[PDB]
Scaffold this motif. Structure first.
Motif, PDB file in Angstrom:
ATOM      1  N   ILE A 116     -57.331 -18.610 -40.386  1.00  0.00           N
ATOM      2  CA  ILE A 116     -56.462 -19.663 -39.854  1.00  0.00           C
ATOM      3  C   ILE A 116     -55.647 -19.205 -38.658  1.00  0.00           C
ATOM      4  N   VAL A 117     -56.003 -19.705 -37.479  1.00  0.00           N
ATOM      5  CA  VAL A 117     -55.277 -19.404 -36.275  1.00  0.00           C
ATOM      6  C   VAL A 117     -54.687 -20.739 -35.686  1.00  0.00           C
ATOM      7  N   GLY A 118     -55.117 -22.045 -36.185  1.00  0.00           N
ATOM      8  CA  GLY A 118     -54.793 -23.124 -35.597  1.00  0.00           C
ATOM      9  C   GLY A 118     -53.139 -23.251 -35.463  1.00  0.00           C
ATOM     10  N   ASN A 119     -52.578 -23.018 -36.558  1.00  0.00           N
ATOM     11  CA  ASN A 119     -51.271 -23.148 -36.774  1.00  0.00           C
ATOM     12  C   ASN A 119     -50.442 -22.081 -36.066  1.00  0.00           C
ATOM     13  N   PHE A 174     -65.210 -33.933 -32.067  1.00  0.00           N
ATOM     14  CA  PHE A 174     -64.272 -32.956 -32.151  1.00  0.00           C
ATOM     15  C   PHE A 174     -63.182 -32.925 -32.996  1.00  0.00           C
ATOM     16  N   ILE A 175     -62.608 -34.121 -33.063  1.00  0.00           N
ATOM     17  CA  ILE A 175     -61.405 -34.571 -34.238  1.00  0.00           C
ATOM     18  C   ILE A 175     -62.211 -34.233 -35.696  1.00  0.00           C
ATOM     19  N   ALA A 176     -63.460 -34.864 -35.973  1.00  0.00           N
ATOM     20  CA  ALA A 176     -64.034 -34.398 -37.344  1.00  0.00           C
ATOM     21  C   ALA A 176     -64.196 -33.017 -37.318  1.00  0.00           C
ATOM     22  N   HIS A 177     -64.632 -32.436 -36.297  1.00  0.00           N
ATOM     23  CA  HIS A 177     -64.910 -30.852 -36.663  1.00  0.00           C
ATOM     24  C   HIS A 177     -63.664 -30.194 -36.798  1.00  0.00           C
ATOM     25  N   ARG A 178     -62.622 -30.473 -36.262  1.00  0.00           N
ATOM     26  CA  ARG A 178     -61.327 -29.748 -36.492  1.00  0.00           C
ATOM     27  C   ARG A 178     -60.602 -30.223 -37.868  1.00  0.00           C
ATOM     28  N   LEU A 179     -60.901 -31.422 -38.381  1.00  0.00           N
ATOM     29  CA  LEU A 179     -60.548 -31.901 -39.574  1.00  0.00           C
ATOM     30  C   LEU A 179     -61.422 -31.066 -40.620  1.00  0.00           C
ATOM     31  N   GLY A 180     -62.615 -31.038 -40.511  1.00  0.00           N
ATOM     32  CA  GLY A 180     -63.468 -30.339 -41.365  1.00  0.00           C
ATOM     33  C   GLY A 180     -63.122 -28.565 -41.601  1.00  0.00           C
ATOM     34  N   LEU A 181     -62.556 -28.009 -40.867  1.00  0.00           N
ATOM     35  CA  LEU A 181     -62.040 -26.895 -40.872  1.00  0.00           C
ATOM     36  C   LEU A 181     -60.676 -26.430 -41.389  1.00  0.00           C
ATOM     37  N   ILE A 182     -59.884 -27.644 -41.670  1.00  0.00           N
ATOM     38  CA  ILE A 182     -58.613 -27.450 -42.349  1.00  0.00           C
ATOM     39  C   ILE A 182     -58.838 -27.069 -43.736  1.00  0.00           C
ATOM     40  N   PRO A 183     -58.258 -25.830 -44.361  1.00  0.00           N
ATOM     41  CA  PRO A 183     -58.326 -25.490 -45.680  1.00  0.00           C
ATOM     42  C   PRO A 183     -57.520 -26.576 -46.587  1.00  0.00           C
ATOM     43  N   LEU A 184     -58.154 -26.810 -47.696  1.00  0.00           N
ATOM     44  CA  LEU A 184     -57.257 -27.573 -48.544  1.00  0.00           C
ATOM     45  C   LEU A 184     -57.053 -26.943 -49.979  1.00  0.00           C
ATOM     46  N   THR A 185     -55.809 -27.126 -50.430  1.00  0.00           N
ATOM     47  CA  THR A 185     -55.762 -26.461 -51.838  1.00  0.00           C
ATOM     48  C   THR A 185     -56.650 -26.961 -52.734  1.00  0.00           C
ATOM     49  N   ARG A 189     -46.864 -35.802 -28.905  1.00  0.00           N
ATOM     50  CA  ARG A 189     -46.889 -35.851 -30.309  1.00  0.00           C
ATOM     51  C   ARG A 189     -47.719 -35.039 -30.847  1.00  0.00           C
ATOM     52  N   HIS A 190     -47.411 -34.056 -31.876  1.00  0.00           N
ATOM     53  CA  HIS A 190     -48.398 -33.016 -32.312  1.00  0.00           C
ATOM     54  C   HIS A 190     -49.020 -33.452 -33.652  1.00  0.00           C
ATOM     55  N   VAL A 191     -50.083 -34.029 -33.664  1.00  0.00           N
ATOM     56  CA  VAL A 191     -50.598 -34.539 -35.027  1.00  0.00           C
ATOM     57  C   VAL A 191     -51.094 -33.194 -35.647  1.00  0.00           C
ATOM     58  N   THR A 192     -50.273 -32.780 -36.717  1.00  0.00           N
ATOM     59  CA  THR A 192     -50.839 -31.610 -37.414  1.00  0.00           C
ATOM     60  C   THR A 192     -51.341 -31.831 -38.581  1.00  0.00           C
ATOM     61  N   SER A 193     -51.701 -30.891 -39.555  1.00  0.00           N
ATOM     62  CA  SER A 193     -52.338 -31.087 -40.648  1.00  0.00           C
ATOM     63  C   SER A 193     -51.229 -31.804 -41.607  1.00  0.00           C
ATOM     64  N   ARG A 194     -49.900 -31.822 -41.139  1.00  0.00           N
ATOM     65  CA  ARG A 194     -49.067 -32.570 -42.381  1.00  0.00           C
ATOM     66  C   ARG A 194     -49.064 -34.076 -42.255  1.00  0.00           C
ATOM     67  N   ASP A 195     -49.951 -34.616 -41.372  1.00  0.00           N
ATOM     68  CA  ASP A 195     -50.115 -35.952 -41.254  1.00  0.00           C
ATOM     69  C   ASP A 195     -51.441 -36.221 -42.139  1.00  0.00           C
ATOM     70  N   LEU A 196     -52.121 -35.527 -42.648  1.00  0.00           N
ATOM     71  CA  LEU A 196     -53.100 -35.853 -43.694  1.00  0.00           C
ATOM     72  C   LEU A 196     -52.698 -36.293 -44.897  1.00  0.00           C
ATOM     73  N   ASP A 253     -46.044 -22.433 -40.312  1.00  0.00           N
ATOM     74  CA  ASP A 253     -46.193 -23.817 -39.292  1.00  0.00           C
ATOM     75  C   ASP A 253     -47.520 -24.668 -39.842  1.00  0.00           C
ATOM     76  N   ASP A 254     -47.531 -25.635 -39.229  1.00  0.00           N
ATOM     77  CA  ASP A 254     -48.759 -26.553 -39.799  1.00  0.00           C
ATOM     78  C   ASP A 254     -49.919 -26.372 -38.657  1.00  0.00           C
ATOM     79  N   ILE A 255     -51.217 -26.679 -39.234  1.00  0.00           N
ATOM     80  CA  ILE A 255     -52.227 -26.587 -38.388  1.00  0.00           C
ATOM     81  C   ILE A 255     -52.187 -27.658 -37.488  1.00  0.00           C
ATOM     82  N   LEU A 256     -52.464 -27.319 -36.055  1.00  0.00           N
ATOM     83  CA  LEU A 256     -52.581 -28.307 -35.037  1.00  0.00           C
ATOM     84  C   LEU A 256     -53.749 -29.141 -35.132  1.00  0.00           C
ATOM     85  N   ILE A 257     -53.889 -30.677 -35.182  1.00  0.00           N
ATOM     86  CA  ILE A 257     -55.132 -31.275 -35.061  1.00  0.00           C
ATOM     87  C   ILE A 257     -55.411 -31.718 -33.715  1.00  0.00           C
ATOM     88  N   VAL A 258     -54.439 -32.380 -33.085  1.00  0.00           N
ATOM     89  CA  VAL A 258     -54.359 -32.740 -31.657  1.00  0.00           C
ATOM     90  C   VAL A 258     -53.263 -32.970 -31.199  1.00  0.00           C
TER      91      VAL A 258
END
Ligand SMILES: [Zn+2]
Ligand SMILES: [Zn+2]
Lengths: 148, 50, 115, 64, 257
Positions: D13-16, E62-73, E112-119, E132-137
């Motif tokens: 992960i490097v997006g963060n 593009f948004i869907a692709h970057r959402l798919g790559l966010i790791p989830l617990t 505004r930074h839509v990050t993974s914290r908004d999921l 820090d949180d993963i940047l979505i857009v």
């Protein structure tokens, strides 16, 4: 018992022309009992040899000491007591050419036997009285053990 | 010649180059020499030839 | 356009069977296990486990095409030992191996976490 | 246009880490030390975060 | 019965990576364990994105692709969650998927930074790992992003989004005792971190009767699973695949007789 040739050789030289290949070396050797001459390509990683080493060649047409033709198929699951137990370097190959010193009239007096062991070549020069079991397109085994 | 070009090969004529002495030596069958002819041929065959 | 769905690399849809047996007529006591929807992961371990069995004379695998999802494992054994039995024994030994490794890994993780 | 979420090669992960990297650079850190402080050891991730251009910043200048 | 007796020694164990050693094992078994680490350990990742409004500078795919790559617990729930294909529901349900919702609107002056914290996810056990949180857009004033996603269960053979590892460093025979790789000039090559030679020596002496016996691993987790759980799930998954193959083989043998 299928023993085509039997002698003890001295390693006179190793790779006279240079290190042609890394894992294979060419031994130029000379016997003293029958006074023959054996160029032989041997693997070195699995079986090292040094200059001035004595080793016994027992080149034979069969390891099973019965005369039964092996037919040349790998049979690792065999229990009968083959000849490859008293020698620490066993090779398999084909006698691919037999040279000599024939004239138009006189018979052969100094024969050369060329044997290719899957690529590793060997030349055996000597008196024709010893090289009679060798025949063209005959599959033979080469047996080597060093002598202390 | 009448031959398609896909089935012909390169070959060497063994008669054009050798000199007269070499050509006669290596292409003329000899039968005066009994020893050589007996070495090359079987006993019945050499008997028939001679 | 012609991109296959990604899930066809590991899913069997109606019509195919996971494994098939085909006797090899070239030599006695040989089998050609054709496994669908697998890859080198289950080919390599099976070949290596079969190679240890002293009654297995030949054991190889191939992937006929990297785009087709199918492996072919050829096994030839001693006359007194069926190739199918060799395959089953190899899988059983691999399962035992993996169970033992899992148990030992869990013990090691517990030890490291404790101290 | 924007920092990839994951390294293309390995998947780390490097997006963060883009904003942290920019902040470190503004703190008078050289690029090598900035990358090291972010845990990017393999040179694939270092490639990913060192060679990126933040084109979304320029894209956001236009009115919606 | 010619199965091996593998042994495991763990050298390092952090929250990011596990560094262990496997002894007395085939090269094939170790390699297949590595391949299972990479591509056959299930995790949960976003795989169904439906976008209601998207005024961002990035198009929907593009948004869907970057959402798919966010790791989830996916620590413990991945075992209890069934694949969507095998589930009896019509499209998706809580027993085979996890629902995510993103709803951001930028009306302040600064970006505004839509990050993974908004999921926002209904299930509390499945969250983005940065929480820090993963940047979505990034969003300019007046732009909004409103979407709802569903996360399935899958493994790396399907898509790299389901890869749990972040580089599986696999090594064996750090000194060429087996000569599996022939160095033209051995003196030029750096020693491996697991090497056991002094400065003078460049590589170990050749071992004519040796086989790969010790395998050094370094499994680095992206965040979806703890590394120990990646290894445990990998071994369990390989065992399950082999058992399924054995079941099918038994059925085929019984059908052929
Ligand atoms: Zn990387
Ligand atoms: Zn469902």
């Amino acid at each position: 018992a299928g023993i085509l040739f039997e002698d003890i050789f001295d390693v006179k030289d190793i790779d006279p022309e240079g290190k042609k290949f890394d894992r294979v070396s060419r031994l130029h050797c000379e016997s003293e009992s029958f006074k023959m001459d054996l160029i032989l390509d041997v693997n070195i990683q699995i079986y090292p040899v040094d200059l001035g080493d004595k080793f016994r060649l027992v080149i034979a047409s069969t390891l099973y000491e019965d005369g039964t033709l092996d037919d040349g198929e790998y049979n690792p699951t065999d229990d009968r007591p083959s000849r490859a137990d008293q020698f620490e370097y066993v090779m398999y190959g084909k006698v691919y050419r037999i040279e000599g010193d024939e004239t138009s009239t006189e018979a052969a007096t100094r024969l050369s036997a060329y044997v290719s062991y899957g690529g590793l070549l060997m030349r055996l020069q000597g008196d024709a009285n010893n090289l009679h079991g060798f025949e063209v397109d005959s599959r033979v085994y080469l047996l080597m053990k060093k002598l202390a | 010649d009448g031959l398609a070009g896909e089935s012909v090969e390169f070959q060497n004529l063994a008669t054009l180059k050798p000199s007269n002495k070499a050509f006669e030596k290596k292409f003329r069958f000899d039968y005066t020499n009994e020893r050589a002819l007996r070495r090359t041929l079987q006993e019945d065959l050499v008997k028939d030839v001679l | 356009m012609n991109a296959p769905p990604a899930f066809e690399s590991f899913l069997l849809f109606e019509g195919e069977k996971k494994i098939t047996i085909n006797k090899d007529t070239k030599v006695p006591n040989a089998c050609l296990f054709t496994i669908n929807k697998e890859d080198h992961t289950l080919g390599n371990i099976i070949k290596s486990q079969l190679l240890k069995d002293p009654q297995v004379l030949f054991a190889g695998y191939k992937v006929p095409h990297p785009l087709e999802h199918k492996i072919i494992i050829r096994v030839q054994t001693t006359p007194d030992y069926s190739p199918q039995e060799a395959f089953t024994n190899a899988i059983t030994d691999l399962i035992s191996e993996l169970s033992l490794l899992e148990e030992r890994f869990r013990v090691a993780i517990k030890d490291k976490q404790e101290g | 246009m924007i920092i990839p979420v994951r390294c293309f090669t390995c998947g780390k992960i490097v997006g963060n880490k883009w904003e942290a990297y920019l902040g470190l650079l503004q703190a008078e850190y050289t690029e090598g030390d900035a990358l090291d402080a972010l845990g990017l050891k393999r040179y694939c991730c270092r490639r990913m975060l060192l060679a990126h251009v933040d084109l979304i910043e320029k894209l956001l200048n236009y009115a919606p | 019965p010619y199965a091996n007796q593998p042994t495991v020694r763990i050298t390092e164990l952090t929250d990011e990576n596990v560094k262990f050693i496997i002894e007395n094992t085939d090269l094939a078994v170790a390699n297949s364990i590595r391949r299972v680490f990479i591509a056959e350990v299930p995790i949960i990742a976003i795989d169904w994105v439906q976008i209601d409004a998207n005024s961002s500078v990035l198009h929907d795919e593009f948004i869907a692709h970057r959402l798919g790559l966010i790791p989830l617990t996916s620590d413990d729930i991945v075992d209890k969650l069934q694949y969507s294909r095998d589930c009896t529901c019509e499209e998706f349900c809580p027993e085979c998927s996890v629902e995510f919702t993103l709803d951001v609107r930028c009306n302040e002056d600064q970006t505004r930074h839509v990050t993974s914290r908004d999921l926002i996810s209904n299930s509390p056990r499945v969250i983005p790992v940065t929480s820090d949180d993963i940047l979505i857009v990034k969003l300019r004033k007046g732009q909004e992003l409103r979407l709802r996603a569903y996360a399935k269960k899958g493994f790396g053979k399907e898509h790299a989004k389901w890869n749990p590892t972040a580089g599986v460093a696999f090594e064996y025979d750090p000194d060429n005792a087996l000569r599996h790789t022939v160095y033209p000039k051995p003196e030029e090559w750096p020693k491996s971190e697991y090497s056991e030679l002094d400065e003078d020596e460049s590589q170990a002496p050749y071992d004519p009767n040796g086989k790969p016996e010790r395998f050094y691993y370094n499994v680095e987790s992206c965040g979806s699973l703890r590394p120990e759980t990646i290894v445990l799930s990998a071994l369990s998954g390989l065992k399950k695949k082999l058992s399924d193959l054995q079941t099918q083989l038994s059925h085929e043998i019984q059908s052929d007789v």
